[PDB]
Amino acid sequence: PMAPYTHKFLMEEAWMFTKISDPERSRAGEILIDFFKKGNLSAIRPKDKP
Amino acid sequence: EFSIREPNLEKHQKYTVFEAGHTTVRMKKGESVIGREVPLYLYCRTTALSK
Amino acid sequence: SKTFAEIAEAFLEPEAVRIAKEAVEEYGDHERKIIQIGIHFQVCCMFCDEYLSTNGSDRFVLIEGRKRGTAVSLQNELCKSYDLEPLPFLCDIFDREEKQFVEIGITRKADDSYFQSKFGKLGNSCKIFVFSYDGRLDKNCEGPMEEQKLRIFSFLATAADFLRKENMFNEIFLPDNEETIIEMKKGKTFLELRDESVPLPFQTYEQMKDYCEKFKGNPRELASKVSQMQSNIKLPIKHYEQNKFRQIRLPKGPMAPYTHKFLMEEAWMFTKISDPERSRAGEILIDFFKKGNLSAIRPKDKPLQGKYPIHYKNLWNQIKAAIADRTMVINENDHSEFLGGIGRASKKIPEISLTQDVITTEGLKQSENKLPEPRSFPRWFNAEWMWAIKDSDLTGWVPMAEYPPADNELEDYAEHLNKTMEGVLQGTNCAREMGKCILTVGALMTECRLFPGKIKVVPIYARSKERKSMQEGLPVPSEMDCLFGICVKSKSHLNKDDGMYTIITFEFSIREPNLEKHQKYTVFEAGHTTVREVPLYLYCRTTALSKIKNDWLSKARRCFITTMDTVETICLRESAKAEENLVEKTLNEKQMWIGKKNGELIAQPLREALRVQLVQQFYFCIYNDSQLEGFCNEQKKILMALEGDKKNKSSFGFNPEGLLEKIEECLINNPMCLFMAQRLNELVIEASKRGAKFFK
Amino acid sequence: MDMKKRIHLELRNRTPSDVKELVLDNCRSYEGKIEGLTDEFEELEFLSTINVGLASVANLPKLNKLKKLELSDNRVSGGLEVLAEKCPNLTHLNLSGNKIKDLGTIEPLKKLENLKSLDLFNCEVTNLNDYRENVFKLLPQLTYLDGYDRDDKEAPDS
Amino acid sequence: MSLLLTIAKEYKRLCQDAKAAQMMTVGTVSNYTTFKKWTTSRKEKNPSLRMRWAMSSKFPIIANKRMLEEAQIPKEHNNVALWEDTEDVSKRDHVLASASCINYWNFCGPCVNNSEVIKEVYKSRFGRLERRKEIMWKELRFTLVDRQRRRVDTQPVEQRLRTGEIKDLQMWTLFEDEAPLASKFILDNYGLVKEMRSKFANKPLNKEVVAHMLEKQFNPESRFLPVFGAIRPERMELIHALGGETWIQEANTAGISNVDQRKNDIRAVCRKVCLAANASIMNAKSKLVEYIKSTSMRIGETERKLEELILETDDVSPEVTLCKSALGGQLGKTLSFGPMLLKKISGSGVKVKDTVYIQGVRAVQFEYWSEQEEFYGEYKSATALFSRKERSLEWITIGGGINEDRKRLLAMCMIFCRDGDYFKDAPATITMADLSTKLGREIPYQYVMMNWIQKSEDNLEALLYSRGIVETNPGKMGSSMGIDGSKRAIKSLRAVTIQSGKIDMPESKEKIHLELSDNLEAFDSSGRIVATILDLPSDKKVTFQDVSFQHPDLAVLRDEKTAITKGYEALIKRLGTGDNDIPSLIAKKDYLSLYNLPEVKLMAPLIRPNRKGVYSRVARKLVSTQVTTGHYSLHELIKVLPFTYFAPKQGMFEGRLFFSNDSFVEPGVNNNVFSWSKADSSKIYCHGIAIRVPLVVGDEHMDTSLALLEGFSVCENDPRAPMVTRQDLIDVGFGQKVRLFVGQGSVRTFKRTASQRAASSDVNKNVKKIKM
RNA sequence: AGUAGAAACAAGGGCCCUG
């Protein structure tokens, strides 16, 4: 069989949400919370069957 | 991880995949911007690391 | 459910439920009427609908839910204030924009009867509105507000659907004014009887009802009668330690002979190799026939013992002929007719065609049932028990399915233990008898189903596999088809369960018989056979079977289940007390008493004692009858008393002699019962050396 | 709902021979197969079938006067050869949202000489290298692509 | 079709007879059920026997004939028979056959296009399988087990329902033409029905089987079984393969089925609202009921009403009990005294008065029960069986596994029985302040001593000392308990017994309708208290997810977002029936009269004033485009209308519509301010809050009569109006009448005019106007 | 002949069918 993907992350098939950078909130714990506030993540509700 | 490209069985073997609603794509339109909705996928995987 | 209130709470508001409940309690009526009232009340509510007048005040004022006296007080108050005439009867609601009371009605019948009665009772005094659960309305004035009508009809429709679903949409729960008295239609004959079935002191149900509804407790007379009855009884109590158990008295007479249809120990068989293509019986019976040994047989007219040898001889010759014809069928001659009980069924004689003269000619008395006769202790049972414990030179006698996969340690353990037990058991002799019975009974059942009214020929055979030596020599041991004898059926017209279809059994042996044991058989001297050369005998007899027996004999793989249960229980119980895997040790080390030899006890590991329990279960499956049933049902008391003796529990009883009598009553001409009873006596004897409660 | 009832509803007593446009979006078609269409529709010049669980266009009947089509949100794959025979006078097409795996599937469309614009968005084909140019070299008759002509000339409204 | 004509001919032929006519004329349709029993009645004693006796035959099976001809099923394929032309005696339209034919069908028979629908039919069992596959087994060990018997659930099930709610659901998902009137459970749970219908539609299926499977999919199989370890349905379904009396197959099964989280969330919500209502002094009852009905929560995908879930669960907690009592929900006969659990086995009694002096001389009344009674008790990992006798703890036995739990259970038991001298003479430490009445609400000395124990361990030790202590007699050494909770000692407490092995929990399939007071204390046809607000944790802060506290007091939002939400609510309330409403106007294509509604006029001040004209233009544009044709989405007009009040202007529309509070909505994509989905088309999410849109009209998405039922109602029957189907029902005019067939053997008359009012208020109010 | 039990079978219905 063919060799599968091995790297940890995704390069070409990836995707990203965007937002403006605030130097007063330039940390992961803050960036994640801010991204979560607008409620675009909460909409992510994967169905049961994959 | 997030993705907007359905997978293939060979390259994506260690990955467990789902379908998480939809999302939006933004592109120029003359002098304005528009938004075209597309599906959305979620790629699940486990792995180890070290120092 | 469980009460009408909970039901009403399903589609009503609990408030109106409580209201109607308090109301029926006020009038003290049957609580089955909670429903109607609540509905009426709720309607009134959904009528008011927070409607308002020009003056910004409430338009409608409820009167229904209130008490009767208070309701009349308010009614008169309003008739006075607004200067209206007092009504004779009470109402449900009153309006202000028109200043005239309003009455609401409801019914299920699609007719004006309710509205006609109400209008006659009240003429045109006030406004009356009667709705129907099926969309009808009858009134004496202009129609109500639209919203009111919609909300009322919708509510009523839902309620009616619910009721119809609950079967309560009847006059009982939804009666009119008149049909409010439901009662059992007590007739005349029923009363005449009821007044005749009364106890003695009373003579009419009324007296009994008055005595029971008012009965009061008088403990003193009760205690006095108790003591009196306690004195005229004198219940005996017998602690076993003082009153010991005598031995059991077996019957006396001749010995109990062989009863099983097939031979086990004295059986001789011819073997061959099995080809997968030819696997049916009608085929193997020919394969064995070609080599010439089955045809080499040629008995003589002089039997060692038995009766009717000529019939048996002719039947054997006919069997050989039929086999040669490649058709397992036999013709109806005098011989077969005699052995198959063809025409020996009684002839019927109606009484309408009978006179006192007909009875005198040939005595027609009532049949004198000849119950079985007693027997003695059999001395050949231990021999069979000891022979059925040893190997048979082969294995795989009893077919078994495959083992599924495994994922956890549990299934691995189960598979390992099951493999050990199956490999140990499949090599014995009892196993080959089980497989023989299985296959032969299957063939006979198939034949009885397909070819009734026709005498057939079925073999007595089995399939096995030679044991596995080391890799040396010829590997992959082969299979084997073995043949012990021949069987024959006779017109198994099983019109009904429990029926009887006589079979015949031609078996092969190399051991001369005994009159006591092989009493029913009829042996012949056939000739010689190899191994060197040795004489040959031919055991022949007659018997019968049924659907029930065939089915239960074919399902003879339960003994494995029981034995596995017992063993796994012991091993797991020993392993848990120490919290460690003690199974192989428990199988190879733990010793179990088996028997006595030279007045001493004998023991061997459980791994080898399993065979004893297996044979016990097999015999239970074989010799099962009512006698053995009663015995095994009545012996538990003795074992429980024994256990009580082992633990110093001062047991006692009321009448052990009766127990011994009941036990010894069901011991007749059934070898298994006699054997187990003698062994139980020996048990209590051997334990008397270590325990009390037993006499010698 | 169902394309049958949807259609019978859109046809407010109107014959299927005098209409110039039709829409069936947000419907359902068993087995992803058309149901209720015939050659009776002659004057029809526009069509819209979106998000109806469709998978093949085999059943589609002949429609000459048709000049615009929309099949987005479905999962059509490898049924493009039929379009030429049924609707050769077609000019505008849309397939964004369907299962298009390779340029081989899109070759038949060259025979639609009347074709002007095509719309492929969110398909796998778009994720290749030199796809717009290779497509243009395949379909020279086609001018617009996903709303952009060579040199990225935004197309007008209509 | 021709089949229809054949059915009609058969009906005619059958009516030609006299008996059939009499029976089809007399009575109602229910008689059918009865007729279903008098026919085809035949059983057998030992089917195993007769099965071996029959399968031994040639043609033991029956089968259809035309199905075989159409399927081209031959006879004597390869010299082996399959069937022969005959007629069974019972069916008269079936033919004998053999088992081999079935294999023939399975191998060279007719094939269907697809069969994955099965996975939905039997979802419960595929779920069992998957749950199994996601397990990580472990070693096996041998030892003895303390298996306690108790009533539990073995089938994991989401949205557990009743039977009356299920019978309608089956009909509305499979047989809609034969459907009855819409019940409340449907109108409330619309998306659920839509989902269950999307799968079993346009498919070749046997429907009875599907209905049975759905019943199983909504039934938690309750059993009285021995159990060990944790209690979760995910385990009980395979308990047989985890451990027995002597063995245990260790395995981790914690991360599956996400059940108990829902229950703990529910109980947390109940506690919160109970405390809230307790903040009141005279209407905590109505306050609590309002908080209940003014609240909802999400389950998986769907949003359910709280009062609906509470009446379906069986969590015996002092919180759920109160709620189920307020709503008149019946429940079991289970008690609660603080954290512990209790259940009465036998005995009786009646209240009695007594007093105690707190400090010096301070008389305080405390009650007890004057009789002998027996009680089972269950604390964390500890069981007990005790008896009370006239203000004393007669005896008690325990089968727990911990010393701390043992001591706490014993102390709470002693309290529950008012045993000891403390109830005769309280300690000095307590005072009148600690007595009761945080703000006026009294407290019986019982819970007083309770909190006094929970405060310090030394109070507990002293309380235990209040129980008689003696020297451990010989032999009873094993059945003894010290002060620390040791299975043996030289000196132990009085009238106590210990043992290894929990106690078998009793059982009773009984229900009771209880009530409560204005102080939140429930009573059960007696002076006994089953629950209160003092037996629950004091308070704690939690962040509830996927919840809707649509109530002023139970809200944290500001006046701005609340004003927006209320404007949207009013604008939706204008979504009803009658002219001057938006549906009639759409039907008439009067897209202009919408701009002049009063509701948009009240929400206009909230619009960004510097760009209100541009947005207005766009909104009006969209509206006309949707209205002129008929292809509209109701979830977008309700969103953009508030902007059409002002006058159009010129400018560049970036793509967003802002209010005056820096909160926008976008036309086509869901955001935090306005969201919805095609799955649940009966909800609108604004600022997290949910709003229930009525079902009066159906757009392109909604594809059945289900979306129109809240626009119809029953009215007086009129034989003049026409009789129509359930599909043409959409082409009627608001305010018109029409006859119709409903369910079975029932015809009625409907009118497309709604009635938003309910019965709750119209009854409660009119009642309160009677207690004066 | 035989079975088994504390009574029943050892074909039954109309030359034809049947468990």
CSV table of C-alpha atoms in Angstrom, one decimal, chain E residues 101-385:
chain,number,residue,atom,x,y,z
E,101,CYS,CA,-35.9,-22.0,-2.0
E,102,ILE,CA,-34.9,-19.3,0.4
E,103,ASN,CA,-31.3,-19.9,-0.3
E,104,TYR,CA,-32.1,-19.7,-4.0
E,105,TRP,CA,-33.6,-16.3,-3.4
E,106,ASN,CA,-30.6,-15.1,-1.4
E,107,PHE,CA,-28.2,-16.3,-4.1
E,108,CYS,CA,-29.9,-15.8,-7.5
E,109,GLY,CA,-32.9,-13.7,-6.6
E,110,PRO,CA,-34.1,-10.1,-7.1
E,111,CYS,CA,-31.7,-7.5,-5.7
E,112,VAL,CA,-32.7,-4.0,-4.4
E,113,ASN,CA,-30.8,-0.9,-5.2
E,114,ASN,CA,-29.6,-0.1,-1.7
E,115,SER,CA,-30.1,-1.4,1.9
E,116,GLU,CA,-28.1,0.8,4.2
E,117,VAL,CA,-31.4,2.0,5.6
E,118,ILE,CA,-31.1,-1.0,7.9
E,119,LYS,CA,-28.5,0.8,10.0
E,120,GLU,CA,-31.1,3.4,10.9
E,121,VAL,CA,-33.8,0.9,11.6
E,122,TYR,CA,-31.7,-1.0,14.2
E,123,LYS,CA,-29.6,2.0,15.4
E,124,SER,CA,-29.7,0.8,19.0
E,125,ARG,CA,-27.9,-2.4,18.2
E,126,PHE,CA,-25.3,-0.9,15.9
E,127,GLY,CA,-24.7,1.5,18.8
E,128,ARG,CA,-24.2,-1.4,21.1
E,129,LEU,CA,-21.7,-2.9,18.6
E,130,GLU,CA,-19.8,0.4,18.2
E,131,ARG,CA,-19.7,1.1,21.9
E,132,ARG,CA,-18.2,-2.4,22.3
E,133,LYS,CA,-15.6,-1.8,19.6
E,134,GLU,CA,-14.4,1.4,21.4
E,135,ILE,CA,-13.4,-0.6,24.6
E,136,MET,CA,-9.9,-1.3,25.8
E,137,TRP,CA,-10.0,-4.6,27.7
E,138,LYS,CA,-7.7,-5.5,30.5
E,139,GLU,CA,-6.4,-8.4,32.6
E,140,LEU,CA,-8.7,-11.0,34.3
E,141,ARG,CA,-8.7,-11.6,38.0
E,142,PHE,CA,-10.5,-13.9,40.4
E,143,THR,CA,-12.0,-12.9,43.7
E,144,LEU,CA,-15.3,-12.5,45.5
E,145,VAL,CA,-17.7,-9.7,44.6
E,146,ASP,CA,-20.2,-7.6,46.6
E,147,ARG,CA,-23.0,-7.7,44.1
E,148,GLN,CA,-26.0,-5.6,45.2
E,149,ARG,CA,-29.4,-6.0,43.7
E,150,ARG,CA,-31.3,-2.9,42.5
E,151,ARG,CA,-33.4,-1.4,39.8
E,152,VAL,CA,-31.5,0.1,36.9
E,153,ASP,CA,-31.6,0.8,33.2
E,154,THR,CA,-29.8,-1.3,30.6
E,155,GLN,CA,-30.6,0.5,27.3
E,156,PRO,CA,-28.8,3.8,26.7
E,157,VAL,CA,-31.5,6.1,25.2
E,158,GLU,CA,-31.6,9.8,24.3
E,159,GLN,CA,-34.8,11.7,24.7
E,160,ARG,CA,-36.6,9.0,26.7
E,161,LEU,CA,-40.4,9.4,26.2
E,162,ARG,CA,-43.7,8.0,27.3
E,163,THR,CA,-46.0,5.7,25.3
E,164,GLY,CA,-48.6,8.3,24.3
E,165,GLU,CA,-45.8,10.4,22.9
E,166,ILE,CA,-44.4,7.5,20.9
E,167,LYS,CA,-47.6,6.2,19.3
E,168,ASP,CA,-48.3,9.6,17.6
E,169,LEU,CA,-44.6,9.9,16.6
E,170,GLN,CA,-44.8,6.6,14.7
E,171,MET,CA,-47.9,7.6,12.8
E,172,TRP,CA,-46.5,11.1,11.9
E,173,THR,CA,-43.3,9.5,10.5
E,174,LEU,CA,-44.8,6.6,8.5
E,175,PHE,CA,-48.6,7.0,8.1
E,176,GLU,CA,-49.2,10.7,7.7
E,177,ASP,CA,-52.3,10.4,5.5
E,178,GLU,CA,-53.9,8.4,8.3
E,179,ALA,CA,-52.6,10.8,11.0
E,180,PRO,CA,-54.7,12.1,13.8
E,181,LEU,CA,-55.0,15.7,15.1
E,182,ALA,CA,-51.7,17.3,15.9
E,183,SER,CA,-50.8,16.8,19.6
E,184,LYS,CA,-48.7,19.2,21.6
E,185,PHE,CA,-45.7,17.0,21.7
E,186,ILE,CA,-45.5,17.3,17.9
E,187,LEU,CA,-45.9,21.0,17.6
E,188,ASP,CA,-43.2,21.3,20.2
E,189,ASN,CA,-40.9,18.7,18.8
E,190,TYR,CA,-41.0,19.5,15.1
E,191,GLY,CA,-37.3,19.0,14.1
E,192,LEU,CA,-37.2,15.6,15.7
E,193,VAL,CA,-40.2,14.4,13.6
E,194,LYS,CA,-38.6,16.0,10.5
E,195,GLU,CA,-35.4,14.1,11.1
E,196,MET,CA,-37.1,10.7,11.7
E,197,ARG,CA,-39.2,11.3,8.6
E,198,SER,CA,-36.3,12.3,6.3
E,199,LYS,CA,-34.8,8.8,6.6
E,200,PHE,CA,-37.9,6.6,6.2
E,201,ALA,CA,-39.3,8.5,3.2
E,202,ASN,CA,-39.4,7.3,-0.4
E,203,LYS,CA,-38.0,3.9,0.6
E,204,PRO,CA,-39.2,0.3,0.1
E,205,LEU,CA,-39.8,-1.0,3.6
E,206,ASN,CA,-42.0,-3.0,5.9
E,207,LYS,CA,-43.4,-0.3,8.2
E,208,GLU,CA,-44.6,-2.4,11.2
E,209,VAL,CA,-41.0,-3.6,11.8
E,210,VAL,CA,-39.9,0.0,11.7
E,211,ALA,CA,-42.4,1.0,14.3
E,212,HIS,CA,-41.4,-1.8,16.6
E,213,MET,CA,-37.8,-0.8,16.3
E,214,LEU,CA,-38.6,2.8,17.1
E,215,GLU,CA,-40.4,1.6,20.3
E,216,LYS,CA,-37.2,-0.2,21.3
E,217,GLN,CA,-35.1,2.8,20.4
E,218,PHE,CA,-37.2,4.9,22.9
E,219,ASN,CA,-37.5,2.3,25.7
E,220,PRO,CA,-35.0,2.2,28.6
E,221,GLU,CA,-35.1,-1.5,29.7
E,222,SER,CA,-35.5,-1.3,33.4
E,223,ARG,CA,-34.4,-4.4,35.3
E,224,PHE,CA,-33.8,-5.5,38.9
E,225,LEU,CA,-30.4,-7.1,38.8
E,226,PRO,CA,-27.3,-7.7,40.8
E,227,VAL,CA,-24.7,-5.0,40.1
E,228,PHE,CA,-21.1,-4.2,41.0
E,229,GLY,CA,-19.0,-1.1,40.5
E,230,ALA,CA,-20.2,2.0,38.7
E,231,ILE,CA,-23.8,2.2,37.4
E,232,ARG,CA,-24.1,3.2,33.8
E,233,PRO,CA,-26.3,1.8,31.0
E,234,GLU,CA,-23.2,1.5,28.8
E,235,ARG,CA,-21.9,-1.2,31.2
E,236,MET,CA,-25.2,-2.9,32.2
E,237,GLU,CA,-25.8,-3.8,28.6
E,238,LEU,CA,-22.8,-6.2,28.7
E,239,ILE,CA,-22.5,-6.6,32.5
E,240,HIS,CA,-22.5,-10.4,31.8
E,241,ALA,CA,-19.0,-9.9,30.3
E,242,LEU,CA,-17.4,-7.8,33.0
E,243,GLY,CA,-17.7,-9.9,36.2
E,244,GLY,CA,-19.5,-12.5,38.1
E,245,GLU,CA,-19.6,-13.9,41.6
E,246,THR,CA,-16.0,-15.1,41.4
E,247,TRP,CA,-14.3,-13.4,38.4
E,248,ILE,CA,-13.8,-9.9,37.0
E,249,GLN,CA,-12.8,-8.9,33.5
E,250,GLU,CA,-11.4,-5.4,34.1
E,251,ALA,CA,-12.1,-2.8,31.4
E,252,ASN,CA,-12.4,1.0,31.1
E,253,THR,CA,-15.8,2.2,29.8
E,254,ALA,CA,-15.9,5.8,31.1
E,255,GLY,CA,-15.7,7.8,27.8
E,256,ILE,CA,-18.9,6.6,26.1
E,257,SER,CA,-22.5,7.6,25.7
E,258,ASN,CA,-22.2,10.9,27.7
E,259,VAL,CA,-25.2,10.2,29.8
E,260,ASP,CA,-24.7,11.3,33.4
E,261,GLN,CA,-23.5,14.7,32.3
E,262,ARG,CA,-27.0,15.5,31.1
E,263,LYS,CA,-28.4,14.5,34.5
E,264,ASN,CA,-26.0,16.4,36.5
E,265,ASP,CA,-26.6,19.5,34.4
E,266,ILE,CA,-30.3,19.1,34.9
E,267,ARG,CA,-29.9,18.8,38.6
E,268,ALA,CA,-27.7,21.9,38.7
E,269,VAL,CA,-30.3,23.9,36.8
E,270,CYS,CA,-33.0,22.6,39.2
E,271,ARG,CA,-30.9,23.7,42.2
E,272,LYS,CA,-30.3,27.1,40.7
E,273,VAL,CA,-33.9,27.8,40.0
E,274,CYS,CA,-35.0,26.5,43.3
E,275,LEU,CA,-32.7,28.9,45.1
E,276,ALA,CA,-33.9,31.7,42.9
E,277,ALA,CA,-37.5,31.1,43.8
E,278,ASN,CA,-36.5,30.7,47.4
E,279,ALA,CA,-35.2,34.3,47.3
E,280,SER,CA,-38.9,35.2,47.3
E,281,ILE,CA,-41.1,35.2,50.4
E,282,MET,CA,-44.7,34.8,49.3
E,283,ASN,CA,-44.8,33.5,45.7
E,284,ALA,CA,-41.7,31.3,45.4
E,285,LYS,CA,-44.2,28.7,44.1
E,286,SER,CA,-45.3,30.7,41.1
E,287,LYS,CA,-41.9,32.2,40.7
E,288,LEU,CA,-40.5,28.7,40.4
E,289,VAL,CA,-43.1,27.6,37.9
E,290,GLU,CA,-42.5,30.7,35.8
E,291,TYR,CA,-38.7,30.1,35.9
E,292,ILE,CA,-39.4,26.6,34.8
E,293,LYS,CA,-41.7,27.4,31.8
E,294,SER,CA,-39.4,30.3,30.9
E,295,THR,CA,-36.5,28.0,30.3
E,296,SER,CA,-35.2,25.5,27.8
E,297,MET,CA,-32.1,23.5,27.1
E,298,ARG,CA,-30.4,21.7,24.2
E,299,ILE,CA,-30.1,17.9,24.0
E,300,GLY,CA,-27.6,16.8,21.4
E,301,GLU,CA,-28.9,18.8,18.4
E,302,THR,CA,-32.5,19.5,19.5
E,303,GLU,CA,-33.8,22.0,22.1
E,304,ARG,CA,-36.2,20.7,24.6
E,305,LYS,CA,-38.4,22.4,27.2
E,306,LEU,CA,-37.3,21.8,30.8
E,307,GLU,CA,-40.7,20.9,32.2
E,308,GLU,CA,-40.8,18.2,29.5
E,309,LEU,CA,-37.5,16.5,30.4
E,310,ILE,CA,-38.2,16.7,34.2
E,311,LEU,CA,-41.4,14.7,33.7
E,312,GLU,CA,-39.5,12.0,31.8
E,313,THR,CA,-36.5,11.4,34.0
E,314,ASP,CA,-36.3,9.3,37.2
E,315,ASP,CA,-33.5,11.0,39.1
E,316,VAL,CA,-34.6,10.9,42.8
E,317,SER,CA,-32.9,14.0,44.0
E,318,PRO,CA,-34.3,16.6,46.5
E,319,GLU,CA,-34.2,19.1,43.6
E,320,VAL,CA,-36.0,17.2,40.8
E,321,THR,CA,-38.5,16.1,43.4
E,322,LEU,CA,-39.6,19.6,44.2
E,323,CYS,CA,-39.9,20.6,40.5
E,324,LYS,CA,-41.9,17.4,39.6
E,325,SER,CA,-44.1,18.3,42.6
E,326,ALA,CA,-44.8,21.9,41.4
E,327,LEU,CA,-45.8,20.6,38.0
E,328,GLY,CA,-48.1,18.0,39.6
E,329,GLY,CA,-45.8,15.3,38.4
E,330,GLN,CA,-46.3,12.0,40.2
E,331,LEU,CA,-43.2,10.2,41.5
E,332,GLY,CA,-42.0,7.3,43.6
E,333,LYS,CA,-42.1,6.8,47.4
E,334,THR,CA,-38.5,7.7,48.0
E,335,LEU,CA,-37.3,10.0,50.8
E,336,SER,CA,-34.3,12.3,51.2
E,337,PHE,CA,-32.7,13.6,54.4
E,338,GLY,CA,-29.7,15.7,53.4
E,339,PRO,CA,-27.2,13.9,51.2
E,340,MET,CA,-28.4,10.5,52.3
E,341,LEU,CA,-31.1,8.4,50.7
E,342,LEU,CA,-33.9,6.5,52.5
E,343,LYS,CA,-36.8,4.2,51.7
E,344,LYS,CA,-39.4,2.8,54.0
E,345,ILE,CA,-40.0,-0.9,54.2
E,346,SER,CA,-42.7,-1.3,56.9
E,347,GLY,CA,-44.2,0.3,59.9
E,348,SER,CA,-46.3,3.4,60.6
E,349,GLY,CA,-46.7,6.2,63.1
E,350,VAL,CA,-47.9,9.7,63.6
E,351,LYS,CA,-46.4,13.1,64.6
E,352,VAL,CA,-45.8,14.1,68.2
E,353,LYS,CA,-44.6,17.2,69.9
E,354,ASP,CA,-41.6,17.6,72.2
E,355,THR,CA,-39.2,20.4,73.3
E,356,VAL,CA,-35.6,21.0,74.1
E,357,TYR,CA,-33.6,23.7,75.9
E,358,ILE,CA,-30.9,25.2,73.7
E,359,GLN,CA,-28.9,27.3,76.2
E,360,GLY,CA,-30.0,27.3,79.8
E,361,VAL,CA,-33.7,27.5,79.4
E,362,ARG,CA,-34.9,28.1,75.8
E,363,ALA,CA,-37.9,26.0,74.8
E,364,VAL,CA,-37.9,24.9,71.2
E,365,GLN,CA,-40.5,22.5,69.7
E,366,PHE,CA,-39.3,19.5,67.8
E,367,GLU,CA,-41.4,16.6,66.5
E,368,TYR,CA,-40.9,12.9,66.2
E,369,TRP,CA,-42.9,9.8,65.2
E,370,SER,CA,-44.6,7.6,67.8
E,371,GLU,CA,-44.2,4.1,66.5
E,372,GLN,CA,-41.9,1.3,65.3
E,373,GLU,CA,-40.6,1.6,61.7
E,374,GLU,CA,-38.0,0.1,59.5
E,375,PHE,CA,-35.9,1.9,56.9
E,376,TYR,CA,-33.3,1.2,54.3
E,377,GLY,CA,-30.5,3.8,53.8
E,378,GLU,CA,-27.9,4.4,51.2
E,379,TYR,CA,-25.0,6.8,51.5
E,380,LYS,CA,-21.8,6.9,49.3
E,381,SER,CA,-20.5,3.4,49.1
E,382,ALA,CA,-22.4,2.4,52.2
E,383,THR,CA,-25.7,0.7,53.0
E,384,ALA,CA,-27.7,0.3,56.2
E,385,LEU,CA,-30.9,-1.2,57.5
